[PDB]
Symmetry: C3
Subunit: 231 residues, 3 copies
């Protein structure tokens, strides 16, 4: 495993997702409020699935070689199996916080599915120029998600409990900044133009993934907004 230079970042990612999972699991012990239980379940699942996929990349299972540009290129496909399930869970935490209507939840989850599925097709496409077609369609689906989070969700939170509104605004801003960096890393890294080497690309996705999953969860699960209003 140590033969690949990016191993150290996969190992550190594995450890941090593991530790984040155990922390949120212990913290959610004994919570009995039904609304809080939903947020603890969603939020604890997200680093638990990322732990399994980081471990699969560390041990070499989650890597394949894709020929493009006359080379055999190493593509970590397990990233997409993680993000297929973890990105809609993160969006569901936001939508539940603002009591989003069911049609908006379905639009967000379906656009997220299209973003990750087209990202995976782009990562495994053997004709170099067509990789960037799939990157553009996936980016258009991310822009729809970010538009709804600012022009659908923001206007509803501002009519709810003040602690729900302030917590949503922080997590919305966290999400828009961190998720917007992923298409840029892909475009400049090994899957795209090849300017940044795989070892630095792996470091960048590790910092983004721990921030967007464990950092986001620490903010949400310390908030009063996840409990029902009660005496």
């Amino acid at each position: 495993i140590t033969g690949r230079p990016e191993w150290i970042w996969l190992a550190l990612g594995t450890a941090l997702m593991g530790l984040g999972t155990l922390y949120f699991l212990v913290k959610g012990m004994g919570v009995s409020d039904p609304d809080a239980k939903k947020f603890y379940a969603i939020t604890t699942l997200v680093p638990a699935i990322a732990f399994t996929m980081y471990l699969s990349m560390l041990l070499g299972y989650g890597l394949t070689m894709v020929p493009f540009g006359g080379e055999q290129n190493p593509i970590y496909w397990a990233r997409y199996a993680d993000w297929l399930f973890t990105t809609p869970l993160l969006l569901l935490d936001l939508a539940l916080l603002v009591d989003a209507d069911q049609g908006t939840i379905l639009a967000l989850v379906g656009a997220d599915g299209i973003m990750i599925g087209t990202g995976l097709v782009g990562a495994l496409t053997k004709v170099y120029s067509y990789r960037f077609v799939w990157w553009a369609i996936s980016t258009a689906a991310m822009l729809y998600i970010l538009y709804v989070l600012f022009f659908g969700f923001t206007s509803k939170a501002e009519s709810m409990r003040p602690e729900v509104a302030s917590t949503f605004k922080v997590l919305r801003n966290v999400t828009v900044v961190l998720w917007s960096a992923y298409p840029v890393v892909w475009l400049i890294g090994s899957e795209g133009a090849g300017i940044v080497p795989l070892n630095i690309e792996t470091l960048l996705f590790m910092v983004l993934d721990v921030s967007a999953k464990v950092g986001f969860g620490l903010i949400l699960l310390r908030s009063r907004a996840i409990f029902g209003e009660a005496e």
Copy 2:
């Protein structure tokens, strides 16, 4: 891409699914009624996922070669990844229109999963005679779905708002006729007996797919039945 004769129908399919997606997206702008939003989300997602899969077949990603009958046969597997998600969404539009109970929705979606999953196993099976075993099991699951749509759903719609009943009856009849043609095309085309060439088979599925997705959606989203009754 132009080396395959069926390319023109894949390109036309891509364009029509793309145009249908953009039309329904613009039309659903500003709709604020929660019931209408659910139907716009479901109905807009369906040509958006079909657009991505038609594009994957145009560019060659969604094609594999399966050896059977002593030949290498071209099988477009991306059709099944589209229909795995788009066929239950179309059934959910019908079920929501009639306020179907949750047990019936689960039976319809699960039978649909079995229909498409066994269709895919049949399309990729290398022993020729066994392809038709999977076709028969998939057809039996389609007959269950059509039985419920006529002997479960029809009897509930007739007790609801008149505009919900008339709109359901039209979309039910559209769905029964168009979906019944898919097993016949598969059986006579490249996946089955091989009587109709792949270029004509691709034309037939394009006409069916645009009719069952964009045609169905134009009927539903122009109806008063998708809005709640309000003053």
Copy 3:
């Protein structure tokens, strides 16, 4: 098909899952109570998906060869495609019986996903020692599920209708005993240490699968607990 010694158990499994599906389908004819319909839909789907996967193993589609330990080893991967959908359906029957809160249902289904997904990664891993790492992570996710079924669910059932409590207690005990045997069979069989031959391993999983699906369903669907209380 008869060239593999385990064929007879795959054929018997196919038949029993087929017969169980047809029995539950006929029995659920005419049931009109909405709560009972949910349990019939969930419970009938489970042997129907297992029938398709047993048939795929009988015909040879659901088998692949994985090199580990210097051999090419036969791994029936279709077991995991069955259990990915059938194990959360069985857990949903239990959760609905006790009216479990939505956060607990999500935790159970997500832990179940992690159990089966890591089991599949373990079954297809080519480095022998790492197969047992994935077995341990999957077993830890099963222990979480069993903890919730005894220390979350048992305490809620005891506050509901007496027939719901007694039926849950029986099905909980059935589930804990039969599901705990699966990791032991995997560890001693072809996927693991290789002490028990594939033909006996296949017999063991057939007896467990029919008991945990058709046996469990016969107990549940004969119970008064699946109907709403009504005059």
